XYZ file of N, CA and C in Angstrom:
324
model
N -35.287 18.716 -7.661
C -36.488 18.968 -6.844
C -37.208 20.249 -7.320
N -38.532 20.190 -7.453
C -39.328 21.286 -8.004
C -39.556 22.440 -7.002
N -39.183 23.692 -7.327
C -39.401 24.800 -6.372
C -40.861 25.252 -6.223
N -41.135 26.041 -5.154
C -42.449 26.584 -4.840
C -42.383 28.125 -4.720
N -43.530 28.780 -4.959
C -43.656 30.230 -4.825
C -45.120 30.596 -4.564
N -45.359 31.466 -3.591
C -46.689 31.979 -3.246
C -46.707 33.496 -3.379
N -47.804 33.984 -3.912
C -48.039 35.414 -4.044
C -48.332 36.027 -2.657
N -47.589 37.086 -2.272
C -47.834 37.744 -0.999
C -48.783 38.923 -1.232
N -48.373 39.906 -2.088
C -49.222 41.057 -2.352
C -48.699 41.956 -3.455
N -49.589 42.783 -3.988
C -49.232 43.766 -4.991
C -48.645 44.940 -4.233
N -47.384 45.270 -4.519
C -46.734 46.395 -3.833
C -47.132 47.699 -4.559
N -47.313 47.691 -5.876
C -47.855 48.800 -6.644
C -48.864 48.249 -7.700
N -49.644 49.160 -8.307
C -50.646 48.842 -9.304
C -51.618 47.723 -8.813
N -52.474 48.085 -7.860
C -53.458 47.138 -7.312
C -54.523 46.737 -8.326
N -55.325 45.685 -8.001
C -56.427 45.187 -8.849
C -57.344 46.387 -9.237
N -57.644 47.242 -8.243
C -58.440 48.453 -8.407
C -57.595 49.743 -8.346
N -56.880 50.059 -9.448
C -56.031 51.246 -9.577
C -55.999 51.685 -11.056
N -56.191 52.980 -11.333
C -56.227 53.527 -12.690
C -54.956 54.302 -13.072
N -54.357 53.973 -14.246
C -53.160 54.622 -14.791
C -53.531 55.266 -16.157
N -53.062 56.499 -16.503
C -53.442 57.063 -17.821
C -52.809 56.350 -19.026
N -53.268 56.610 -20.276
C -52.679 55.898 -21.430
C -51.258 56.278 -21.764
N -50.479 55.324 -22.352
C -49.080 55.525 -22.741
C -48.157 56.025 -21.630
N -48.548 55.803 -20.368
C -47.814 56.247 -19.174
C -46.837 55.158 -18.712
N -45.602 55.550 -18.399
C -44.584 54.628 -17.883
C -44.863 54.359 -16.419
N -44.628 53.147 -15.942
C -44.903 52.775 -14.548
C -44.113 51.535 -14.173
N -43.885 51.335 -12.881
C -43.182 50.158 -12.366
C -44.235 49.311 -11.688
N -44.164 48.005 -11.927
C -45.077 47.005 -11.335
C -44.235 46.213 -10.374
N -44.634 46.173 -9.092
C -43.883 45.443 -8.085
C -44.799 44.459 -7.411
N -44.314 43.234 -7.213
C -45.020 42.174 -6.488
C -44.147 41.725 -5.310
N -44.784 41.169 -4.296
C -44.069 40.633 -3.152
C -44.388 39.142 -3.173
N -43.363 38.293 -3.240
C -43.528 36.821 -3.383
C -42.742 36.100 -2.296
N -42.989 34.794 -2.094
C -42.194 34.025 -1.136
C -41.851 32.619 -1.617
N -40.702 32.113 -1.154
C -40.318 30.758 -1.422
C -41.106 29.971 -0.387
N -42.269 29.442 -0.798
C -43.102 28.653 0.082
C -42.720 27.133 0.034
N -41.445 26.842 -0.269
C -40.908 25.480 -0.377
C -39.944 25.135 0.722
N -39.549 23.863 0.780
C -38.704 23.315 1.827
C -37.195 23.614 1.660
N -36.772 23.889 0.404
C -35.378 24.139 0.070
C -35.239 25.478 -0.653
N -33.981 25.987 -0.714
C -33.706 27.221 -1.418
C -34.005 27.059 -2.906
N -34.330 28.183 -3.584
C -34.566 28.139 -5.008
C -33.196 27.875 -5.677
N -33.196 27.135 -6.791
C -31.909 26.887 -7.464
C -31.351 28.194 -8.051
N -30.059 28.216 -8.442
C -29.525 29.448 -9.090
C -30.117 29.640 -10.491
N -30.112 30.871 -10.948
C -30.613 31.175 -12.288
C -32.126 31.147 -12.455
N -32.898 31.493 -11.423
C -34.367 31.577 -11.518
C -34.763 33.002 -11.945
N -35.953 33.128 -12.546
C -36.441 34.426 -13.033
C -37.962 34.482 -13.112
N -38.552 35.673 -13.064
C -39.975 35.852 -13.253
C -40.174 36.118 -14.756
N -41.098 35.396 -15.408
C -41.321 35.489 -16.850
C -42.756 35.739 -17.216
N -42.920 36.557 -18.241
C -44.218 36.868 -18.835
C -44.786 35.556 -19.468
N -46.081 35.188 -19.205
C -46.617 33.910 -19.760
C -47.961 34.017 -20.519
N -48.566 35.203 -20.648
C -49.836 35.333 -21.361
C -50.575 36.614 -21.044
N -51.652 36.821 -21.779
C -52.426 38.045 -21.659
C -51.716 39.246 -22.265
N -52.192 40.454 -21.947
C -51.637 41.710 -22.466
C -50.207 41.974 -21.962
N -49.408 42.612 -22.845
C -48.021 42.978 -22.562
C -47.977 44.475 -22.393
N -47.223 44.956 -21.406
C -47.116 46.392 -21.131
C -45.649 46.819 -21.242
N -40.496 43.408 -22.935
C -39.775 42.952 -21.737
C -40.504 41.719 -21.152
N -39.841 40.549 -21.180
C -40.506 39.303 -20.817
C -39.873 38.497 -19.697
N -38.804 38.998 -19.042
C -38.138 38.228 -18.005
C -37.278 39.145 -17.090
N -37.334 38.918 -15.784
C -36.506 39.629 -14.819
C -35.889 38.589 -13.902
N -34.582 38.627 -13.667
C -33.920 37.730 -12.728
C -34.404 38.031 -11.309
N -34.493 36.978 -10.493
C -34.899 37.033 -9.093
C -33.827 36.262 -8.301
N -33.569 36.661 -7.052
C -32.514 35.957 -6.281
C -32.958 34.563 -5.808
N -32.007 33.675 -5.531
C -32.318 32.342 -5.080
C -32.740 32.355 -3.579
N -34.056 32.535 -3.381
C -34.630 32.656 -2.075
C -34.520 31.419 -1.222
N -34.116 31.628 0.077
C -34.102 30.592 1.114
C -35.544 30.243 1.455
N -35.830 29.052 2.014
C -37.217 28.723 2.380
C -37.846 29.781 3.275
N -39.090 30.121 3.012
C -39.878 31.103 3.733
C -39.422 32.569 3.502
N -38.434 32.820 2.628
C -37.956 34.184 2.400
C -38.903 34.937 1.477
N -39.038 36.269 1.725
C -39.848 37.169 0.888
C -38.933 37.895 -0.095
N -39.424 38.234 -1.329
C -38.686 39.088 -2.279
C -39.616 40.104 -2.962
N -39.151 41.332 -3.202
C -39.896 42.334 -3.970
C -39.314 42.263 -5.382
N -40.170 41.977 -6.379
C -39.796 41.813 -7.774
C -40.423 42.939 -8.526
N -39.643 43.686 -9.293
C -40.117 44.844 -10.021
C -39.910 44.682 -11.501
N -40.883 45.123 -12.309
C -40.791 45.108 -13.738
C -41.175 46.468 -14.286
N -40.369 47.039 -15.202
C -40.658 48.350 -15.815
C -41.660 48.183 -16.984
N -42.823 48.809 -16.905
C -43.888 48.679 -17.909
C -44.366 50.013 -18.491
N -45.294 49.963 -19.471
C -45.866 51.145 -20.108
C -47.330 50.816 -20.431
N -48.271 51.613 -19.920
C -49.690 51.323 -20.118
C -50.139 51.456 -21.576
N -51.110 50.617 -22.062
C -51.571 50.719 -23.471
C -52.012 52.092 -23.949
N -51.969 52.289 -25.270
C -52.353 53.563 -25.886
C -53.882 53.887 -25.824
N -54.757 52.881 -25.779
C -56.203 53.135 -25.718
C -56.790 52.726 -24.360
N -57.908 53.384 -23.981
C -58.613 53.158 -22.716
C -59.185 51.736 -22.617
N -59.343 51.217 -21.399
C -59.894 49.882 -21.204
C -59.255 49.113 -20.083
N -59.703 47.853 -19.915
C -59.229 46.913 -18.894
C -58.266 45.940 -19.580
N -57.080 45.725 -19.008
C -56.044 44.848 -19.582
C -55.472 43.915 -18.506
N -55.079 42.674 -18.863
C -54.545 41.721 -17.865
C -53.373 40.954 -18.395
N -52.271 40.915 -17.636
C -51.106 40.117 -17.991
C -50.806 39.079 -16.950
N -50.304 37.907 -17.379
C -49.914 36.807 -16.497
C -48.383 36.691 -16.473
N -47.830 36.359 -15.301
C -46.402 36.122 -15.071
C -46.277 34.867 -14.184
N -45.117 34.233 -14.247
C -44.891 33.020 -13.486
C -43.364 32.767 -13.352
N -42.932 32.236 -12.205
C -41.519 31.943 -11.974
C -41.052 30.829 -12.919
N -39.723 30.808 -13.238
C -39.136 29.864 -14.175
C -37.679 29.537 -13.778
N -37.303 28.255 -13.895
C -35.966 27.821 -13.539
C -35.013 27.989 -14.730
N -33.691 27.905 -14.456
C -32.618 27.913 -15.445
C -32.819 26.839 -16.518
N -33.506 25.731 -16.191
C -33.774 24.656 -17.178
C -35.052 24.918 -18.027
N -35.839 25.953 -17.707
C -37.036 26.302 -18.468
C -38.356 25.789 -17.912
N -38.310 25.303 -16.678
C -39.463 24.733 -16.004
C -40.146 25.846 -15.226
N -41.456 26.086 -15.486
C -42.230 27.075 -14.725
C -42.705 26.480 -13.433
N -42.872 27.300 -12.435
C -43.360 26.833 -11.137
C -44.011 27.980 -10.368
N -44.734 27.647 -9.318
C -45.358 28.621 -8.468
C -46.689 29.142 -8.906
N -47.202 30.110 -8.184
C -48.472 30.775 -8.528
C -48.305 31.648 -9.768
N -49.387 31.761 -10.554
C -49.420 32.711 -11.669
C -49.764 34.039 -10.961
N -49.067 35.118 -11.286
C -49.339 36.447 -10.736
C -49.788 37.386 -11.856
N -50.615 38.370 -11.499
C -51.227 39.235 -12.498
C -50.920 40.725 -12.387
N -51.005 41.397 -13.555
C -50.933 42.846 -13.706
C -52.272 43.181 -14.349
N -53.129 43.930 -13.646
C -54.454 44.268 -14.158
C -54.577 45.799 -14.187
N -54.764 46.385 -15.409
C -54.798 47.826 -15.606
C -56.102 48.344 -16.107
N -56.581 49.453 -15.533
C -57.748 50.180 -15.989
C -57.203 51.518 -16.539
N -57.030 51.612 -17.858
C -56.504 52.819 -18.525
C -57.653 53.804 -18.719
N -57.512 55.066 -18.278
C -58.579 56.064 -18.382
C -58.034 57.387 -18.964
């Protein structure tokens, strides 16, 4: 059975937030199992496109309607500008599911 995931909110690094160049930072998202059954074992959040700032973090097997805070350790690009990365949940078998979530940086 295919799992579900909905984006709750950006816990850090909002759509409108500026970080300096080459600066280390943690990116945290709040997500939920918006499905009828628990997530299977061995699920993870994976990098899937756009700019990269490390491509996978394990996430716990959430019960239906449960919330989780997922954190990824990143580093802002060396030059100024607007950058965007995509992430998406993935099962132990390699199947992606859920909402695509974003990291959007304005380096100044």
